[PDB]
Each structure stands twice: as structure tokens, then as C-alpha cells.
Amino acid sequence: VLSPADKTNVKAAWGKVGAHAGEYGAEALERMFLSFPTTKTYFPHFDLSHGSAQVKGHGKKVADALTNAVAHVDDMPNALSALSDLHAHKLRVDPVNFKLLSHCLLVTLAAHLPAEFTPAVHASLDKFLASVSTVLTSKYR
Amino acid sequence: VLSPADKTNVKAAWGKVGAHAGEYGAEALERMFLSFPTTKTYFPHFDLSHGSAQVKGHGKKVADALTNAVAHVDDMPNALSALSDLHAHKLRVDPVNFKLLSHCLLVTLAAHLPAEFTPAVHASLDKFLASVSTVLTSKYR
Amino acid sequence: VHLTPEEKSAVTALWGKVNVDEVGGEALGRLLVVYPWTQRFFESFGDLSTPDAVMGNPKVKAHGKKVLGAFSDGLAHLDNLKGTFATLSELHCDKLHVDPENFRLLGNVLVCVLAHHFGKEFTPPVQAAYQKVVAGVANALAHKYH
Amino acid sequence: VHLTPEEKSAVTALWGKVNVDEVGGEALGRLLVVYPWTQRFFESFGDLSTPDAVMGNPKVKAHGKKVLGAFSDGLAHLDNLKGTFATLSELHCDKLHVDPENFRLLGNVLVCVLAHHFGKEFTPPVQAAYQKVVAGVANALAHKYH
Ligand code: HEM
Ligand code: HEM
Ligand code: HEM
Ligand code: HEM
């Protein structure tokens, strides 16, 4: 469960991301594709070259979904319901992959927010991304 | 989330286990220690030899907690809150290990209950052990 | 892989009693029922809405026999799993786009099915040898991914 | 560890800029804060109840320096990680009883720390190289477990 302090830390850190969300989402994806190539199996229909428009576009979508979750941090299962259905019933991405994207998002935030990525904040963001992953995987079976 | 059919399936299977719960618990542990030797790091104080009494006694406790969970299948967090605290604040077993014991328990059940271990019951039991695992690691951080 | 002679021979003797057609059908079928997301690769097989439909599906059954047949032929190459499954690894990656985590899930389902079939004969040490085999096959199947 | 020479030069290039003493205390400290169950091995280290207690604990900082010193030394032996880390693998298994999953968690935290310190210089390709390195070290440290 997220604690009051976790929620504060996540809103603060995401607040600083601001209007960079999209860019950071695309970077998180590129990091994932290169560090964990098996994740590429879910995107056979994308051009995955550096700077690809499909990657930027998808980055923004992911980032917007995370922004929505932060905006609704006290009601995430309902805020992400539609996405939860989509992953469970259509996309059917193996659960292990969520841990990989989460880690790459943390690396990306660390690379861009040196003053805000303290140990406490790192801890809260990791818990937050784990909670998002849980919600997204909750209807799989 | 456990559906009505899952609970029924889990109650029926566990019902046949009956007075063998303790023997199966011990057998599941032995299979885990042998198949996944890294799990032995949590029991440096046990004699882990075949038939040692610590494994037996511990297999009984594990099996009884599972029996209690099956009986409280609709209220698990509450019924297992004490074990949840124990694992989170004292034992501090890494979450990955729960998957390993769960697999070994399923193998144990398939071994001893061939007519009852149908595909649907296999599905329910794996979901049930996953939920139990989730409950036991819910207070870790 | 790092298989002890008593382990190598425990695998081999058990495998000689296996009906590949039945076990294959059962392993793949159970994979699809227990981990429903794995159905994503098999939309053209037909109806997979219920366990009964999955287990009775002839395309599921025939695909299971094919998969386990290749697994079976690999048990004669334990000292070289990588070279034996190399072209299969490439196909799974480049043509089929199958997340290798699926190979791990099937392995564990396979181990449960062997236990279901052989009961008492599938002792703790026999299981440990098969766990090493199934992880070795999984790793060989994923080795050419890029 | 299969590393291209250009990956190996990126890894070495960056590592040349690291203050191992400081990065060692940060990585160990963050492991114990983010994944608090790992504190089970350090009960003699005193107060680990809040983030500042952990991050500034002189024993955590000294232990971090020791861990990262040994890790550095491994970066000079990328073609023989298993041999380099054999006695430490044994020690972690037989004396300290450390679940090897802890080595994987530390690797991931080390990657976050490198990213935190180097910012943009820690490009996606450089990360990818470091991920192969931390997995290889974790694997080497686990290799003598039994
Ligand atoms: C932080 C966790 C994640 C979130 C918030 C997220 C969110 C999203 C969003 C917003 C979409 C767009 C759906 C739409 O068009 O409305 C999407 C699609 C998709 N996601 Fe997820 N996702 C997550 C993790 C992953 C993972 C780990 C993978 C697999 C590696 C994955 C694979 C896909 C694929 C293949 C699509 C379809 C892309 C396309 O065809 O355009 N997602 N996701
Ligand atoms: C199915 C999930 C599990 C359940 C239901 C479970 C249940 C229990 C129970 C009932 C106890 C005894 C507490 C007491 O003595 O009153 C216990 C203790 C313990 N468990 Fe868990 N356990 C599970 C998984 C694991 C895993 C995966 C590990 C690590 C591999 C583990 C390691 C331990 C250890 C080391 C103890 C203390 C044993 C002793 O010192 O006597 N458990 N568990
Ligand atoms: C023991 C591990 C496995 C082995 C040994 C194996 C082997 C094979 C073989 C020999 C083929 C025939 C390819 C050809 O016609 O040349 C094949 C096809 C295929 N496999 Fe596997 N396989 C394994 C696991 C899996 C899993 C777990 C999945 C997904 C859940 C999967 C998905 C597929 C798919 C989608 C095809 C193509 C079927 C078609 O043509 O419609 N495989 N496999
Ligand atoms: C990169 C991975 C690691 C390396 C290279 C490493 C290296 C070392 C070294 C050089 C020592 C001192 C050996 C001695 O006292 O003779 C040590 C001790 C120790 N390590 Fe590891 N270590 C690693 C990861 C970890 C992890 C992740 C943990 C647990 C979370 C851990 C737990 C310990 C403990 C408890 C000691 C003994 C502390 C004491 O003196 O009381 N290590 N390690």
C-alpha cells in the first residue's frame, strides 16, 4: 500500500517531470528495448530505430497514463480500469515485462531529476510503479 | 481475484488432502530444497537431510496455515495477518521464493491427487497459492 | 547442462516411459488454461473459451505433440542444447515473436504433468533433474533472441 | 559475459569516472531503503529505521565501499567473472547465507545510482552494457551455491 509520505513523494517527483513526461516515456521505452530485448517481441509492428515516431508516440501514451494514475492516486484501480482490461484481454503481455519497464522508468527519472531522486523518493516511486503494474495485471486470470 | 468456481475448486482439492496435509507440506519443502537450492539460505538452522524432523514439523505448520487460508478463503488478509507480519518484519524472505514453494506444492498435489488435478483445478490452485503469496508479502514495504 | 550421471540417467529412464502425444497435448493445454494470456499466439486454433474446449481442441493437441517431439529430440543432445535449438530459437524470435518467458511457464507446467502421470515415481530428486532440464531448454530456446 | 568491445569500452570509460567509495555507500544504502527486507543481514549495523539513518550510517558506508571495491576488481576480469568471484560465492552461500536474488537487486540499484550520478552521459546503450555486467556479476556470485 502507498503511505501518505509515498503519495507526497510521487506527486512531487511527477510534478517536476511536468511537460517532459512524453519525452521521458519514449526514453524509458528505448532503454527497455536495448537492455531487455525480449520485450521487443510485443512490438513487431513498430519501427524501433532511435527516434522512431511510433516510439515517441507510444512514450507519450504511457506517460499520460502514469500522469493520470498520479492524478488519481487514491483511486488507481478505477482510474486505470480500461487499461487493465486492454492488457489482460487483448495485449496479453507477460507480467514479468512490467518489472522491466518499471526499472527503466526509474533509471530515466534518475537520469533527469538529480535533486529530486533521493533515497526516499526512489523508494516511493518504485512502490508506485509496482502498484501500477499490479493494477494493470489484475484481470489476467 | 478468486472467482466462485476457484474457491469451490480449491475447497474440493484441499478437502481430499485431508489428513495428509502435513506429509504433503514436508514433501513440498523437500522438493523445493532440492530443485531450488537457493531457498536453503533461509533455513541454515535446520537439518535439511531427508526425513529430518525439522522439515516434517515445518511442513505441518505450512500445511496448517494453508488449511486455515482455504477455510478463510473470503477473508485471507485478516486470517493471515499474523503470518504476514512475521514474514515482513522478522523472516524477510525475498518475494521471489514464494513462487518456488508454490510450484513445488502444485507438483506435490499433482503427484498425490491424479483424479482431482484436472486442468481447471490446476488453474484454481495456482491462483490460490499466488493470492496467499501476495497476502504474505503485502506488508514488506 | 550440468547434469550428474545419476541425474542424466534418471531423466532418460523416465522419458522412455512417456507417451509424447498424450503428454504434449496435456502440457500445452494446461499452459493455455492456467496462464490464459499465452493464448495470444493461438487465435487461429479456434475456440479456447473454456478448459474443456482447450483440452479437446485438435489443433492444441497436435501442436502439443510437435512441441514435445522437438523437446524429446533435445534430450539426446543435453551436452549441446544451444546448438540443437539454435534455428528454433531464431524462428521463435524473428518469425513468431514469442516472449521467452513462455518457455519457462511451459517447463513448469510440463513438470506438473509428469508428476500427475507418474505419481510416486516422480520423486524429489527426479523432479530436480527435470527442473534443470526444462530451464536448460528454455535458456537454449531464448539464446538467439536479439 | 558476452560483451562487444565497444560495450566493454563504454563500461570501462564510465567506470573510470566513478568514486567507488561514495557510489558504494549510495548503492548499499539505497538497497536497504528501497528493499527493506534486505536489512535482515545487517542487524549488527545499528540504526536502520529511517532513510537518513541508513544513508549516513558509518557501517553501511564502510560495507558499501568494500562491496563496490570487490565489484571494481571484477570489472578488470570480465572474461573470468566466475573464477574471480569463486571464493566470495562460496562465502556468501556457506557462511553468510545470502539469497542470490539480493545480488540482482543490488545490480539494479547500482544502475539507478549510475544514472543519478551521470545524467545524460548514461545513455540507453551504456545502460544496456551495464545491465549485462551486473547480471554477469550476480550470476558469478551465485555460481557456487548448492
Ligand atoms: C507502466 C506500465 C504500462 C503502462 C502504464 C502502459 C500503458 C499503455 C497505454 C496507455 C497504451 C495505449 C493503449 C491505447 O491506445 O489507448 C498501451 C498499449 C500497449 N502496451 Fe502497455 N503499458 C505498460 C506496460 C507495458 C509493457 C511492459 C508492455 C510490454 C513490454 C506493454 C505493451 C503494450 C503494447 C504492445 C501496446 C499496443 C501498442 C500499439 O499497438 O500501439 N505495455 N499501454
Ligand atoms: C505458501 C507460502 C508460505 C506459507 C503459508 C508459510 C507459512 C509459514 C508458517 C505457518 C510459519 C511458522 C510460524 C510459526 O512458527 O508460528 C513459517 C515460518 C517460516 N517460513 Fe514461511 N511460509 C511460506 C513460504 C515461505 C518461503 C517461500 C520461505 C523461504 C524459502 C519461508 C521461510 C520460512 C522460515 C525460514 C520460517 C521460520 C522457520 C523456523 O525457524 O522454524 N516461508 N512460514
Ligand atoms: C519446450 C518448448 C518449445 C519447443 C521445443 C517448441 C518447438 C516448436 C516447433 C518444433 C515448432 C514448429 C515450427 C515449424 O513448423 O518449423 C513450433 C511452433 C510454434 N511454437 Fe513452439 N516450442 C516450444 C514452446 C512454445 C511456447 C511456450 C509457445 C507459446 C506459448 C510457442 C509458440 C509456438 C508457435 C506460435 C508456433 C507456430 C505454430 C503455427 O505455425 O501456427 N512455442 N514450436
Ligand atoms: C556486487 C555484489 C557483492 C559483492 C561483490 C560483495 C562483496 C563482499 C565482500 C568483499 C565482503 C567481505 C567478505 C569478508 O568479510 O570476508 C562481503 C561481505 C558481506 N556481504 Fe557481500 N557483496 C555483494 C553483495 C551483497 C549483498 C547484496 C548482500 C545482502 C543484501 C551482501 C551481504 C553481505 C554480508 C552480510 C557480509 C558480511 C558483513 C559483515 O562483516 O558482518 N552482500 N561482501
Description:
The complex is a heterotetramer, with two copies of chain A (141 residues) and two copies of chain C (146 residues). Chain A has helices at residues 4-17, 21-35, 53-71, 76-79, 81-91, 96-112, 119-136. Chain A is an all-alpha fold. Chain A has one domain (1-141): Globin-like. In chain A, helix 2 (21-35) packs across helix 3. The longest helix of chain A has 19 residues, at 53-71. Chain C has 146 residues and is an all-alpha fold. Chain C has one domain (1-146): Orthogonal Bundle (Globin-like). In chain C, 68% of the residues lie in helices and 0% in strands. Chain C contains eight helices and no strands. Chain C has helices at 5-15, 20-34, 51-56, 58-74, 81-84, 86-95, 101-118, 124-142. In chain C, helix 2 (20-34) packs across helix 7 (101-118) and helix 7 (101-118) runs antiparallel to helix 8. At the A-D interface, helix 2, helix 6 and helix 7 of A face helix 2, helix 3, helix 6 and helix 7 of D. The structure holds protoporphyrin IX containing FE (4 copies).
CATH architecture call of chain C: Orthogonal Bundle
Could you say what the CATH architecture of chain A is? Orthogonal Bundle
Q: State the total count of DSSP E strands of chain A.
A: 0
The major sheet of chain C is characterized as: none
Instruction: Enumerate how many helices of chain C there are, as a single number.
Output: 8
Which percent band covers the strand fraction of chain C? under 5%
The CATH top-level class label of chain C:
Mainly Alpha
Order of helices and strands of chain A: HHHHHHH
Bound molecules: protoporphyrin IX containing FE
Largest beta sheet of chain A, briefly? Answer: none
CATH topology of chain A: the name is: Globin-like
Stated plainly, the CATH topology of chain C is called: Globin-like
In total, the number of domains of chain A comes to: 1
Quaternary structure of the protein: heterotetramer
Q: What does the radius of gyration of chain C come to? A: 15 Å
- CATH superfamily annotation of chain A: Globins
Number of domains of chain C: 1
CATH superfamily of chain C: Globins
Helix-strand pattern of chain C, N to C?
Answer: HHHHHHHH
The level 1 CATH classification of chain A is Mainly Alpha
